[PDB]
DNA sequence: TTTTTT
DNA sequence: TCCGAGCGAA
DNA sequence: TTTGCCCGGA
């Protein structure tokens, strides 16, 4: 077919999809010769998810010409569940397609399971939203960010991130009181994966809705480290690196009341 | 969309793209355009009857304010979406209180067909509208003001979209004729305007049907005969013949005339009643009792027709109602 | 007012504002005897007004008047009072106020009006209009109100007709028969009668589907036509033959898949000269005990297992 | 063939088989070439060809193989609440149109949209109809709607505005006799002259009823096994029409004006099971076309018949309504 | 964007609120001397209720506003759980304020709160009054249960008079350099019907549209209130003039049949100059037409028939 | 069963004994039943409509149609409320009364009936391949009691699946049947038997039950008192025999049911006393009747025609009464609370007298 | 299951 | 075996 | 100035 992309095991694609399933409903995949990119926007238009999968994630990949596949994530996840984590999963599409084929095939037997999901006429640009020179760029292990978010979300519906010279501060103020976590950069040559990195030109102070961060931290299952890029005038970028590509969340900050 | 815009129904193919293509609402268009020009956009309410240009205008305004990428910069909700209290408190409030993802600027929330929202959701909207005014503006659209709460009405700047007057419809028809290579006679244009009741959707749908009804639309001309054929509507001459027979002839001849006129082109009874009411409205009557009897009895007949019933008995009812009412004229 | 005059005046002395005792009664009427509210009123008013007397009591009373919703019996009493429907009374208690009375309890007000609108001596009767003619006009309006009520609670959910219903079900008929009450205001009997009718329709459905395999009728025809003959095959033989009719009654019950419970239910249905309670009470306990014993001593066919 | 009732057996297969709705069928046939079908609102009285027309149009547009993937049909037998409209209908309207095969593209116009048929749309709640409004407009690029109804006033004004209206006319002897005669010839039904036109007169605008009446009459004739023609008296007996003699008896009782006599006659009359609506129709015909009654009498009786027919349309007791009508006529 | 004038010129101090003079004076007195009672503020839309409560709170609490005020409105969750936990805890919390000052709970749009939730507030109001005081604002005061009304000071606001609206409008006009004529401001007042929000909105709309605020420019964009048109229709002496008003001023302006009929009902209800029995007959006829329209038969003929029947009655 | 109205009910078109022309028509329908249209039987109560429906089904499918069993079917509403429907069935047909479920009758049409329409059935007693080679038959009793929504739900099921299902609807009046449903049906008028036919049937019963009978005129009296209702006449014969020791006499009186006696008493009361107090007592009587399963429409009809029989009233009174009956019969159709409309009718009647 | 106020 | 919750649903 | 039936549970 025009597009043929084989995942060695369907579990890879299932985990990738589960990494952002809860935040958005409709997703637009563009497949090109260099791989598959995808974008989605949440119902309130406050959060945007951007996925990139390179050809190295695939055992075999072929995309003769660019193609766009719009689909609902609930139907896709329902179908992905009908297949086994061990089977080989081939995504197949034809030119000007009305559906996407998910082909679950196991080499042990001669059992083929072919699903066809009807596609939507979702006409929307991606805009490649990424500001060039972000004010502050930091990176830290995913488990620690998850813990900070989970602790502070019990206190308030909003979480403030303040970046200043050599210090990252998370703050939440609520009905029963307030909490404040301060971390500092540190390089540990024995365990680089625990490192906390901070580069910054302009200090930053931005407020975010807690429920959105609670959704965003679900990407921690796909990467041990999370990168955070912040600017005074731009959405905040939360990036989780995959073995081949990436999962990005662009979250708009609250208006300064 | 699929293939060209030539595959679309005319009501959608001719949807205004910019404010200059909205016709017959000049005061509103001028005011809102200068609102945008000066940077003073208040919370808006567009109130009016079907097909007068409300959705067209608000979408054109969004396009002008935000450019071609407006669709990712506004929150548009209508009756096809859930808009309960939970949606107001989560989706709408989050969008109102947060910056734009794509391009910096103020937020626009469009509540189309707002008369479909419950009282509780509308009340939840009050302090959302007031609290986030600095960065967010709401536009509400409605056909029925009575389903909107007084508190919601107070907070909006109201603009009434009128039934489209004759001149605006005429200009839009001229544009359509040029684009379709169509010809339209003056009497046909008059009949079209009369039957549209100032609803542009009716004009465009009828015109498309008329073009489909021609043998050769390049040479054939849309005459009023064509309009009446495709609409299955009475000619004015038929209405006058029936009314004359009712007012001046004996019962046998009036019954015969009604039945024969109806059989000629398979006319519906309700259409005859509407046409005759329009004719009788212009009559000068000595006795107010004549007007009273006519209106009450004909309204009763229209209501009974709306539920089905026996067509022959209803036609005889119309004849008797008119005769008995004019007996009062002495 | 006397039980609290001393307290209010002591407060006036302590807080240093002039209270004329003669107006206290009105204050007491303003708040309907709510002592907390009268103290709140004095506290709030004395902030800028240091003298409460005959020159300001009227507007203070107007501004602070207790607008308390009434309970159903009270709603019915006020709605049927003839004073509020006279020229001056209508000027004072407006049409809007009467509709608000409907909205105080909009599930019982129509029922209360329909219960009690026959129990007045009217003072609003028009010249030459007898009491019965006014009652007939009210009854017609109540029927129309029922039609509106049906439309409100349909799948359409037409709550915008609620004011109209208030007029048709409560205000207009009351306006026709308003006067004085010729007795106490009574709770609506419709609720209990509706409950009883529901019970008996359930019982009728059960009996119908037990006898379905043998009869040819709908349930209504069962009640109107069959049951009177079943009474002669199932009860009268007891009266004419004591315990000798047990076997024949059991044979009929078996033919129609009837239980002892069905027997009781059936006998409950009859009205007028055919009421059975006193007749069955008179049957000797020997016959009833033998009937029950013989019935429980054998098996009986079943029409519907685990209904 | 021998397993279909005639109404379903002779359902039109294509647009050229619909008989008397040319004013609308012509417009529809033009879209096989213009390929810009508008949103449609078919409305009209029972058994005039609305469902047949939409089905035949979809067949002509998509061919037998591609139809199923291009149609969503929802009628009064399906659940159509606001949640259904907001989820199932919206989701179908959103989808990309199924890809047509090469053979399909060769043999059929294959327009670039799908069709949603809301048959019996007048049974949908006003709120669900409201929920359809923006779905119809936003996805016009790939979806066209067809609403079908008997009572156009049950469709909310915004939806009627969005739709292009097609009124289906009543079918009578003037415009449906050809189709009825075709069916009669196909089935080898022998009839006297006048019988088919009488059937269509009795049917009162409904061709389904006329065909069913023809089938019942042919069954009677075949059972009789005598080779004779079906008569008009036989057809009227099958159609529940009151015999002219009985109607004359009623008219004479009304003329006499004695309340008790009218009451007793009506009580006896009801035992025959005559439908009150047919009785009222026949009385209307008898009185309004009678040269022996003057203008005032006919005005009054026309209103009386209108009132009684309206009351019967609400499902009332036929005995009570008929007796009231006859008493009122008698006192004219 | 720039602030709409309604929000730009929202009063920040009590002395900028017009109308309800005696009550505003009492509120200024309280703000100066502390000891704020529990209070219920009620009245019609857009007359200064929310403004007054917020101004009073700001003046009372100064810089302690952020920690000393709990505001909840219809956009918030206010079920029995919230009343029993969040509000109770806020009432119980420590907060040192200057003498005569208390924490303030503002319950805006309180008439939408359920009866059970209101019941849950009674003892919290009573037990913690030495540190917390409650302010309710509502449009329909009869929706606040009597036990809560008992614990509160009752402040019923009246509609704004033409003079108060004129004074506030003149202040804004001088601040904004607006050119106007007396007839223009009178037209603004006429179309506002005592709602200051609407007066300012229509002033902005007229200025944006046509620059100069005179009567003709005002009425180019602002409609005369259709309830007054409907009243004129109902009071006309002969059927033809009433039908003429219906045709020209309502039906051909685009007002829906349902809007016309519901307004007719509301206006007839309040026609104090027509005897009540006549209004009951008229209401019956109006309701018949309303039911027909709800069935989907909302045509001009139905409304004309309604008018004819009303004429038969009032004759 | 044991009661004579049931013991002697005919079981075939050959055993029918009144309205011979209708019997011939039914035989004509059953001659070639493969293209049988949907049927709608209408006529007065108790004349033999269901007897004839069963006889027609017997003629089409054989005596097995009389081997009936009852089964309970479950349904759930959108509000999650549980509902049960009793369904009568033979190997060849189903019988349902959807009005049993009130306003939820629509569910019965949209789920149960539709399912029967879409499925094939097994048969290991008449078919050699285990599948039933025949359409399914569904009898809908009290079809004029279906709500408009349920009737609408029938429309497309009757057309789409005509291959697999045929409907027989039975009703006592067609007035509440919507026009689209009547358009889809072959309408069969079922008139009441004459008094001679009733007398012949009753005489056959008298002979088979060894009842002593002084004169045949007695049967005629019964036949006249039943007003064409054959069920009523057979039950009345049995009751009279039981009360006269299985020996009818010329003096033996006709037995009226309890509810009829109550209604006649109410008529005498209304005629004697026109006043508010009388109206209150009348309300009590009406509540008593309604609570014991006498439907409101039956009460109105019986009261109207009892009043019109009063000898002391004049033509003006009677015309007023029949007008008021028409108006309030429509009210009963359009409303919910029956006592409201019945009381309104009684009040207007009292005023007119 | 809840329309309106002046 | 006894008791009445909560709803009006015949 | 508050009915009739009779829940779920003991
Ligand atoms: N003022 C107008 N000028 C030009 N075209 C119009 C105008 N009004 C309506 N139309 C035409 O009719 C179609 C529908 O216009 P809309 O603006 O969507 O109507 P609407 O006022 O939103 O109707 P409702 O309130 O949703 S029923 C447009 O796509 C145009 O083709
Ligand atoms: N114009 C027609 N041409 C040919 N046959 C028709 C026509 N109209 C009705 N019929 C016949 O009657 C039957 C029913 O036609 P339908 O199209 O289903 O009527 P309908 O307009 O959909 O009726 P409703 O609105 O559902 S009661 C067809 O199968 C045809 O046999
Ligand atoms: N008395 C007033 N004096 C000055 N401005 C007022 C006054 N009343 C209303 N406004 C203006 O209208 C706007 C709204 O005032 P609010 O106090 O919020 O009205 P409201 O009484 O709370 O209306 P509701 O009950 O929420 S619809 C203010 O921001 C002011 O600009
Ligand atoms: N001997 C005889 N009895 C009949 C006949 N038709 C009906 N019956 C009897 O009359 C009773 C009532 O008939 P039924 O069909 O239930 O009346 P319906 O369905 O309400 O019209 C039946 O139980 C039979 O006993 C007939 O043709 N011959
Ligand atoms: Mg619109
Ligand atoms: Mg159809
Ligand atoms: Mg406010």
- DSSP secondary structure string for all residues of D89-121: IHHHHHBPPPPPPHHHHHHS---S-EEEEETTG
Question: What is the spatial distance, in angstroms and rounded to an integer, between the CA atom of C108 and the C1' atom of H5?
Answer: 20
Asked if the Cβ of residue C195 lies within 7 A of any atom of strand H, the reply is yes
Atom of ligand 3 nearest to the CA of E17: 3
- Tell whether D289 and D158 lie within a shared domain: no
Mutate to test the pocket of ligand 2, among D119, D168, D182, D208 (most ligand atoms within 8 A of CB): D208
Contact criterion met (CB below 8 Å) for B130 and B158: no
Would the annotation count B274 as a binding residue? Answer: no
CB pairs under 8 A between C and D: 3
Contact criterion met (CB below 8 Å) for D166 and D40: yes
Triad C180, C184, C190: Cα angle to 5°: 110
Of B239, B229, B236, which Cα lies nearest the Cα of B269? B239
The residue count for chain A: 257
Of A114, A102, A119, which Cα lies nearest the Cα of A10? A102
Please state the domain extents for chain F.
4-189, 195-248, 258-352
User: Tokens at residue F123, please?
Assistant: 């048969």
- Tell whether E15 and E70 lie within a shared domain: yes
Q: Separation of E206 CA from ligand 3 center, angstroms?
A: 20
The DSSP annotation for B109-172 comes to EEETTGGGS-HHHHHHHHHHHHHTTTTEEEEEEES-GGGS-HHHHHHSEEEEPPPPPHHHHHHH
Of C243, C249, C231, C254, which Cα lies nearest the Cα of C303? C254
- Tell whether E238 and E153 lie within a shared domain: no
**From the C1' of G6, which residue's alpha carbon is nearest?**
E159
Nearest CA distance, E151 vs chain C (angstrom) = 7
Euclidean distance between CA atoms D134 and B113, whole angstroms: 9
State if residue D49 touches ligand 2 by the CB under 6 angstroms criterion: yes
The dihedrals phi and psi of E284, each to the nearest 5 degrees, come to -60, -45
Euclidean distance between CA atoms F346 and F342, whole angstroms: 6
Euclidean distance between CA atoms B202 and B233, whole angstroms: 14
Question: What is the spatial distance, in angstroms and rounded to an integer, between the CA atom of C203 and the C1' atom of I6?
Answer: 14
State if residue B56 touches ligand 1 by the CB under 6 angstroms criterion: yes
Distances (CA, A) of B282 to A127, B329, C96, E240, E246: 62, 15, 39, 11, 15
Residue located via tokens 């107090």: F277
- The CATH architecture that domain F258-352 belongs to is Up-down Bundle (1.20)
- Tell whether D216 and D263 lie within a shared domain: no
- Tell whether E147 and E30 lie within a shared domain: yes
Euclidean distance between CA atoms B296 and B275, whole angstroms: 16
Alpha helices per DSSP H over chain B: 10-13, 26-38, 54-66, 85-87, 93-96, 119-131, 150-155, 166-180, 186-196, 200-213, 224-231, 236-248, 251-265, 269-281, 288-306, 311-327
Nearest to B133 among E3, E50, E139 (CB): E3
CA A98 to chain CA centroid, Å, is 26
Contact criterion met (CB below 8 Å) for B67 and B37: no
Contact list, D126 vs chain C (CB under 8 Å): 156
Contact: B42, E209; criterion CB under 8 Å: no
- Tell whether E51 and E72 lie within a shared domain: yes
- Tell whether D228 and D301 lie within a shared domain: no
- Alpha-carbon dihedral of residues E276, E279, E284, E287, nearest 10 degrees? -130
Atom of ligand 1 nearest to the CA of B22: 3
Which C residues in the span 113-142 are in contact with E, Cβ-Cβ below 8 Å?
141
Triad D88, D94, D97: Cα angle to 5°: 110
Distances (CA, A) of B20 to B140, B263, D207, E221: 21, 47, 51, 19
Packing angle of the helix pair D173-186, D207-224 (nearest 10 deg):
40
Alpha helices per DSSP H over A102-235: 142-153, 210-216
Q: Report the phi/psi class of residue C272: left, alpha or beta, with left for phi > 0 and alpha for psi in -120 to 50.
A: left
Determine the 3-state secondary structure of C51 from DSSP. strand
- Which residue of chain F is at minimal alpha-carbon distance from C130? F351
Q: What contacts A24, CB < 8 A, 6 or more positions away?
A: A40, A41, A42, A43, A47, A49, A73
DSSP-derived secondary structure letter, C247: H
Euclidean distance between CA atoms F213 and E177, whole angstroms: 112
User: Tokens at residue F166, please?
Assistant: 């045929």
Question: What is the spatial distance, in angstroms and rounded to an integer, between the CA atom of E112 and the C1' atom of G2?
Answer: 12
Contact criterion met (CB below 8 Å) for D40 and D85: no
User: Tokens at residue E125, please?
Assistant: 């109001």
DSSP-derived secondary structure letter, E272: T
DSSP-derived secondary structure letter, D86: I
Of F44, F56, F42, which Cα lies nearest the Cα of F14? F56
- The residue among E131, E160, E189 that closes a domain is E160
Q: Which nucleotide is nearest to C196 (CA to C1')?
A: I4
B/E touch flag: 3 or more CB pairs below 8 Å: yes
Euclidean distance between CA atoms C259 and A142, whole angstroms: 73
Of F257, F298, F233, F229, which Cα lies nearest the Cα of F48? F229
Distances (CA, A) of D240 to B74, D48, F167: 64, 22, 20
The enclosing H or E element of A117 equals strand A112-118
Q: Report the phi/psi class of residue D161: left, alpha or beta, with left for phi > 0 and alpha for psi in -120 to 50.
A: alpha
Contact criterion met (CB below 8 Å) for F151 and D77: no
Euclidean distance between CA atoms F48 and F230, whole angstroms: 8
Atom of ligand 3 nearest to the CA of E139: 25
Q: How many CA atoms lie within 13 A of D249 on its CB side?
A: 13
Euclidean distance between CA atoms B196 and B163, whole angstroms: 10
Triad C97, C103, C104: Cα angle to 5°: 90
- Tell whether D313 and D260 lie within a shared domain: yes
The enclosing H or E element of D32 equals helix D22-34
Determine the 3-state secondary structure of C231 from DSSP. helix
Contact criterion met (CB below 8 Å) for F214 and F248: yes
- The residue among D171, D205, D228 that closes a domain is D171
Q: What contacts C229, CB < 8 A, 6 or more positions away?
A: F3, F235, F238, F239, F242
Is C35 in CB contact (< 8 Å) with chain E?
no
What experiment produced this structure? cryo-EM
How buried is B116 (Cβ within 10 angstroms: 0-12 exposed, 13-18 middle, 19+ buried)? buried
- Tell whether D20 and D96 lie within a shared domain: yes
Contact criterion met (CB below 8 Å) for E266 and E208: no
Euclidean distance between CA atoms C6 and C27, whole angstroms: 14
Which A residues in the span 129-148 are in contact with B, Cβ-Cβ below 8 Å?
129
Which B residues in the span 173-232 are in contact with E, Cβ-Cβ below 8 Å?
none
Triad F184, F185, F187: Cα angle to 5°: 145
Contact criterion met (CB below 8 Å) for A143 and A137: no
Distances (CA, A) of B139 to A182, B32, B45, B75, F163: 43, 12, 6, 10, 54
- Which residue of chain C is at minimal alpha-carbon distance from D125? C156
Q: Are β-strands B107-111 and B74-77 bridged in parallel, bridged antiparallel, or unpaired?
A: parallel
CA D281 to chain CA centroid, Å, is 18
Q: Which domain holds residue D196?
A: 172-241
Atom of ligand 2 nearest to the CA of D168: 21
Asked if the Cβ of residue C72 lies within 7 A of any atom of strand I, the reply is yes
Neighbours of E15 (CB within 10 A): 10
Question: What is the spatial distance, in angstroms and rounded to an integer, between the CA atom of C196 and the C1' atom of H3?
Answer: 19
Which E residues in the span 199-218 are in contact with B, Cβ-Cβ below 8 Å?
201-202, 204-205, 208-209
Determine the 3-state secondary structure of E41 from DSSP. strand
Alpha helices per DSSP H over chain E: 5-8, 21-33, 49-61, 65-68, 80-82, 88-92, 115-119, 122-127, 146-150, 162-176, 182-192, 196-210, 215-221, 226-235, 239-245, 257-269, 276-292, 300-313
How buried is F197 (Cβ within 10 angstroms: 0-12 exposed, 13-18 middle, 19+ buried)? middle
Residues 230-289 of C with CB under 7 A from strand I: none
End-to-end CA distance of chain E: 58
Is F105 in CB contact (< 8 Å) with chain C?
no
Q: Which domain holds residue E57?
A: 1-160
Alpha helices per DSSP H over chain A: 10-18, 73-82, 142-153, 210-216
**Ligand 3 pocket, Cβ-based, cut-off 6 angstroms:** B 126, 151, 154; E 6, 9-11, 17-19, 45-51, 139, 168, 196-197, 200
Euclidean distance between CA atoms E10 and F30, whole angstroms: 85
Contact criterion met (CB below 8 Å) for C303 and C210: yes
Of D104, D9, D24, which Cα lies nearest the Cα of D64? D104
Of B289, B259, B313, which Cα lies nearest the Cα of D298? B313
State if residue F53 touches ligand 4 by the CB under 6 angstroms criterion: no
The dihedrals phi and psi of E151, each to the nearest 5 degrees, come to -85, 0
Return the CATH number of the domain spanning residue range F195-248: 1.10.8.60
Nearest CA distance, C157 vs chain D (angstrom) = 10
Q: Which neighbouring-strand residues pair with D193?
A: none
- Which residue of chain A is at minimal alpha-carbon distance from E88? A175
The sign of the dihedral angle between the CA atoms of D311, D316, D322, D323 is negative
- Tell whether D126 and D268 lie within a shared domain: no
- The residue among E224, E244, E263 that closes a domain is E224
Alpha helices per DSSP H over chain F: 4-7, 20-31, 49-61, 105-107, 114-118, 148-160, 179-183, 195-208, 217-225, 230-243, 258-272, 276-291, 296-307, 315-334, 338-352
Contact list, C156 vs chain D (CB under 8 Å): 125-126
Exposure pattern of C290-306 as b/e (b: 16+ CB <10 Å)?
A: ebeeebeeeeeeebbee
Return the percent helix, strand and coil in chain A, to nearest 5.
20, 45, 35
Distances (CA, A) of F16 to C200, F47, F317: 36, 12, 44
A/C touch flag: 3 or more CB pairs below 8 Å: no
Euclidean distance between CA atoms A4 and A12, whole angstroms: 16
The topology under which CATH files domain F4-189 is Rossmann fold (3.40.50)
- Tell whether E219 and E229 lie within a shared domain: no
- Which residue of chain F is at minimal alpha-carbon distance from D277? F175
User: Tokens at residue E89, please?
Assistant: 């805890």
């Amino acid at each position: 077919s025009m597009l043929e992309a084989k995942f060695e095991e369907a579990s890879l694609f299932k985990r990738i999809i589960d990494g952002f399933k809860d935040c958005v409903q409709l997703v637009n995949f563009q497949c090109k010769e260099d791989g598959i990119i995808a974008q989605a926007v949440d119902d309130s238009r406050v959060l945007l998810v951007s996925l990139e999968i390179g050809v190295e994630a695939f055992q075999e990949y072929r995309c003769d010409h660019p193609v766009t596949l719009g689909m609902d994530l609930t139907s896709l996840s329902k179908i992905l569940r009908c297949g086994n984590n061990t089977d080989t999963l081939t995504l197949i599409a034809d030119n000007t397609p009305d559906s996407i084929i998910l082909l679950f095939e196991d080499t042990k037997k001669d059992r083929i399971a072919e699903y066809s999901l009807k596609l939507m006429d979702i006409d929307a640009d991606f805009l490649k939203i990424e500001e060039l020179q972000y004010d502050s760029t930091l990176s830290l292990p995913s488990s620690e960010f998850s813990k900070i978010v989970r602790d502070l979300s019990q206190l308030s519906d909003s979480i403030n991130i303040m970046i200043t010279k050599e210090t990252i501060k998370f703050v939440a103020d609520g009905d029963i009181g307030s909490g404040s976590v301060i971390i500092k950069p540190f390089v540990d040559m024995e365990h680089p994966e625990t490192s906390i990195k901070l580069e910054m030109d302009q200090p930053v102070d931005l407020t975010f809705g807690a429920k959105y961060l609670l959704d965003i931290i679900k990407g921690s299952s796909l990467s041990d480290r999370v990168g955070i890029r912040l600017s005074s005038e731009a959405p905040a970028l939360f990036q989780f690196d995959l073995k081949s590509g990436f999962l990005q969340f662009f979250l708009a900050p609250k208006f300064n009341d | 969309e699929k293939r060209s815009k030539e595959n679309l129904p005319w009501v959608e193919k001719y949807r205004p793209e910019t404010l200059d293509e909205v016709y017959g609402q000049n005061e509103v268009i001028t005011t809102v355009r200068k609102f945008v020009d000066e940077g003073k956009l208040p919370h808006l309410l567009f109130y009016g009857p079907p097909g007068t240009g409300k959705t067209s205008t608000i979408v054109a305004l969004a396009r002008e304010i935000y450019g071609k990428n407006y669709s990712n910069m506004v929150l548009e909700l209508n009756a096809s979406d859930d808009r309960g209290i939970d949606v107001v408190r989560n989706q709408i409030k989050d969008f109102a209180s947060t910056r734009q993802i794509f391009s910096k600027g103020f937020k626009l929330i469009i509540l189309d067909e707002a008369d479909a929202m419950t009282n509780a959701a509308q009340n939840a909207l009050r302090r959302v509208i007031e609290r986030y005014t600095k960065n967010t503006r709401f536009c509400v659209l409605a056909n029925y003001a009575h389903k909107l709460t007084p508190a919601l009405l107070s907070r909006c700047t109201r603009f009434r979209f009128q039934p489209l007057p004759q001149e605006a419809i005429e200009r839009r028809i001229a544009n359509v004729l040029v684009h379709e290579k169509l010809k339209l006679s003056p009497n046909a244009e008059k009949a079209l305007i009369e039957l549209s009741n100032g609803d542009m959707r009716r004009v465009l749908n009828v015109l498309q049907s008329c073009k489909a009804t021609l043998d050769n639309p390049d040479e054939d001309e849309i005459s009023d005969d064509v309009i009446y054929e495709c609409c299955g509507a009475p000619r004015p001459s038929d209405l006058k013949a029936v009314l004359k027979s009712i007012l001046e002839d004996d019962w046998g001849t009036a019954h015969y005339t009604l039945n024969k006129v109806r059989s000629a082109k398979g006319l519906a009874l309700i259409d005859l009643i509407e046409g005759i009411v329009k004719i009788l409205e212009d009559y000068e009557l000595q006795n107010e009792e004549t007007r009273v009897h006519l209106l009450t009895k004909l309204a009763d007949i229209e209501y009974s027709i709306s539920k089905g019933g026996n067509d022959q008995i209803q036609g005889s009812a119309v004849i008797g109602a008119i005769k008995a009412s004019f007996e009062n004229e002495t | 007012a006397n039980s609290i005059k001393s307290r209010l005046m002591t407060i006036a002395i302590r807080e240093k504002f002039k209270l004329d005792p003669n107006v206290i009664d009105r204050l007491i009427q303003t708040t309907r005897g709510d002592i907390r509210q009268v103290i709140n009123l004095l506290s709030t008013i004395s902030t800028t007004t240091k003298t409460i007397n005959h020159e300001n009591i009227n507007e203070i009373s107007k501004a602070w008047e207790k607008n308390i919703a009434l309970k159903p019996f009270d709603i019915a009493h006020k709605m049927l009072d003839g004073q509020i429907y006279s020229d001056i009374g209508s000027r004072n208690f407006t049409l809007n106020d009467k509709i608000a009375l409907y909205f105080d309890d909009f599930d019982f007000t129509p029922l209360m009006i329909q219960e009690n609108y026959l129990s007045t001596r009217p003072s609003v009767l028009k010249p030459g209009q007898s009491h019965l003619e006014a009652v007939a006009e009210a009854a017609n309006c109540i029927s129309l109100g029922d039609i509106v009520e049906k439309k409100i609670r349909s799948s359409e959910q037409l709550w915008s007709l609620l004011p109209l219903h208030a007029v048709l079900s409560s205000v207009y008929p009351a306006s026709k028969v308003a006067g004085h009450m010729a007795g106490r205001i009574n709770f609506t009997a419709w609720l209990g009668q509706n409950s009883k009718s529901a019970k008996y329709y359930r019982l009728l459905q059960e009996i119908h589907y037990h006898t379905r395999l043998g009869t040819s009728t709908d349930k209504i025809g069962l009640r109107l036509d069959y049951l009177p003959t079943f009474r002669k095959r199932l009860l009268d033989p007891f009266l004419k033959q004591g315990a000798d009719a047990i076997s024949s009654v059991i044979e009929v019950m078996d033919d129609y898949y009837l239980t002892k419970e069905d027997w009781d239910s059936i006998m409950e249905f009859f009205v007028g000269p055919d009421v059975t309670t006193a007749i069955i009470k008179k049957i000797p306990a020997t016959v009833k005990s033998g009937f029950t014993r013989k019935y429980n001593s054998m098996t009986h066919p079943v029409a519907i297992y685990r209904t | 063939l021998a397993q279909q009732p005639w109404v379903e057996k002779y359902r039109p297969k294509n647009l050229d088989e619909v008989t008397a709705q040319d004013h609308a069928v012509t417009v529809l046939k033009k879209t096989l070439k213009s390929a810009n079908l508008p949103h449609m609102l078919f409305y009209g009285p029972p058994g005039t060809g609305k469902t047949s027309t939409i089905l035949a149009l979809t067949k002509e547009l998509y061919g037998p193989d591609l139809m199923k993937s291009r149609i969503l049909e929802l009628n009064a037998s399906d659940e159509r609440g606001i949640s259904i409209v907001r989820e199932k209908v919206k989701n179908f309207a959103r989808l990309t149109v199924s890809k047509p095969s090469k053979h399909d593209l060769e043999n059929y116009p294959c327009p670039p949209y799908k069709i949603i048929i809301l048959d019996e749309a007048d049974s949908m709640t006003a709120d669900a109809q409201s929920a359809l409004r923006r779905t119809m407009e936003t996805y016009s690029g790939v979806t066209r709607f067809c609403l079908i109804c008997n009572y156009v006033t049950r469709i909310i004004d915004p939806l009627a505005s969005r739709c292009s209206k097609f009124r289906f006319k009543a079918l009578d002897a003037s415009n449906a006799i050809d189709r009825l005669r075709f069916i009669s010839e196909q089935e080898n039904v022998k009839c006297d002259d006048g019988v088919l036109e009488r059937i269509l007169d009795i049917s009162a605008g409904d061709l389904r009823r006329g065909i069913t009446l023809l089938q019942s009459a042919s069954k009677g004739a075949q059972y009789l096994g005598d080779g004779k023609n079906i008569t008009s008296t036989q057809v009227e007996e099958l159609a529940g029409v009151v015999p002219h003699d009985i109607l004359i008896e009623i008219v004479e009782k009304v003329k006499s004006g004695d309340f008790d006599e009218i009451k007793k006659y009506v009580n006896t009359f009801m035992k025959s099971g005559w439908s009150a609506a047919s009785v009222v129709n026949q009385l209307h015909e008898y009185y309004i076309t009678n040269d022996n009654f003057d203008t005032n009498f006919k005005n009054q009786i026309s209103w009386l018949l209108f009132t009684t027919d309206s009351r019967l349309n609400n499902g009332t007791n036929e005995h009570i309504q008929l007796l009231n009508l006859l008493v009122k006529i008698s006192q004219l | 964007l720039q602030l709409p004038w309604v929000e730009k010129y929202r009063p920040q101090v009590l002395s900028d609120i017009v109308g309800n003079k005696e009550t505003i004076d009492r509120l200024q007195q309280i703000a100066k001397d502390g000891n704020m009672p529990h209070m219920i503020i009620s009245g019609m839309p857009g007359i200064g209720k929310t403004t007054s409560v917020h101004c009073l709170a700001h003046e009372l609490l100064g810089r302690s506003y952020a920690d000393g005020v709990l505001e909840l409105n219809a956009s918030d969750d206010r079920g029995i759980d919230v009343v029993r936990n969040q509000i109770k805890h806020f009432a119980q919390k420590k907060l040192h304020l200057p003498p005569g000052k208390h924490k303030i709970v503002i319950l805006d749009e309180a008439d939408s709160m359920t009866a059970g939730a209101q019941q849950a507030l009674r003892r919290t109001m009573e037990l913690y009054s030495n540190s917390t005081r409650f302010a309710f604002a509502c449009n329909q005061s009869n929706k606040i249960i009597e036990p809560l009304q008992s614990r509160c000071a009752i402040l019923r606001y009246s509609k704004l008079s033409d003079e108060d609206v004129l004074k506030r409008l003149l202040q804004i006009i001088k601040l904004e350099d607006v050119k106007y004529t007396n007839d223009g401001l009178e037209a603004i007042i006429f179309t506002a019907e005592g709602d200051m929000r609407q007066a300012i909105n229509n002033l902005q709309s007229t200025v944006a549209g046509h620059g100069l605020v005179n009567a003709d420019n005002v009425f180019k964009i602002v409609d005369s209130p259709h309830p007054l048109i409907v009243k004129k229709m109902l009071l006309a002496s002969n059927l033809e003039d009433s039908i003429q008003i219906l045709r020209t001023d309502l039906w051909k302006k685009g007002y829906s049949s349902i809007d016309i009929v519901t307004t007719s009902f509301r206006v007839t209800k309040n026609l104090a100059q027509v005897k009540e029995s006549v209004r009951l007959e008229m209401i019956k006829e109006i309701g018949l037409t309303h039911m027909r329209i709800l069935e989907g038969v909302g045509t001009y003929l139905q409304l004309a028939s309604m008018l004819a029947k009303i004429h038969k009655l009032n004759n | 069963m044991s009661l004579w109205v049931d013991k002697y009910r005919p079981k075939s078109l050959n055993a029918l004994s009144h309205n011979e022309e209708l019997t011939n028509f039914l035989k004509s329908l059953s001659d070639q039943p493969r293209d049988l249209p949907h049927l709608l039987l209408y006529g007065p109560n108790g004349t033999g409509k269901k007897t004839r429906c069963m006889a027609l089904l017997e003629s089409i499918f054989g005596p097995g149609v009389y081997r009936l069993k009852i089964d309970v079917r479950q349904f759930v509403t959108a509000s999650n409320r549980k509902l049960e429907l009793n369904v009568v069935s033979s190997p060849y047909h189903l019988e349902i009364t959807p009005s049993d479920m009130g306003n939820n009758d629509r569910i019965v049409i949209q789920e149960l009936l539709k399912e029967v329409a879409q499925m094939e059935q097994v048969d290991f007693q008449d078919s050699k391949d285990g599948l039933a080679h025949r359409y399914k038959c569904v009898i809908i009793n009290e079809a004029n009691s279906l709500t408009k929504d349920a009737q609408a739900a029938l429309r497309r099921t009757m057309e789409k699946y005509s291959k697999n299902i045929r409907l027989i609807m039975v009703c006592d009046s067609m007035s509440p049947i919507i026009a689209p449903i009547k358009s889809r049906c072959l309408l069969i008028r079922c008139p009441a038997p004459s008094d001679s036919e009733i007398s012949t049937i009753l005489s056959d019963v008298v002979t088979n039950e060894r009842i002593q009978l002084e004169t045949k005129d007695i049967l005629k009296r019964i036949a006249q008192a039943s007003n064409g209702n054959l069920r009523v006449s057979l039950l009345m014969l049995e009751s009279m025999a039981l009360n006269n020791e299985l020996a009818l006499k010329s003096s033996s009186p006709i037995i009226k049911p309890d509810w009829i006696i109550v209604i006649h008493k109410l008529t005498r009361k209304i005629v004697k006393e026109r006043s508010v107090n009388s109206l209150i007592e009348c309300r009590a009587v009406l509540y008593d009747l309604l609570a014991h399963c006498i439907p409101a429409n039956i009460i109105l009809k019986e009261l109207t025609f009892s009043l019109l029989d009063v000898e002391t009233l004049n033509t003006t009174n009677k015309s007023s009464i029949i007008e008021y009956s028409s108006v309030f019969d429509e009210r009963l159709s359009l409303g919910n609370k029956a006592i409201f409309h019945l009381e309104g009718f009684i009040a207007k009647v009292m005023c007119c007298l």
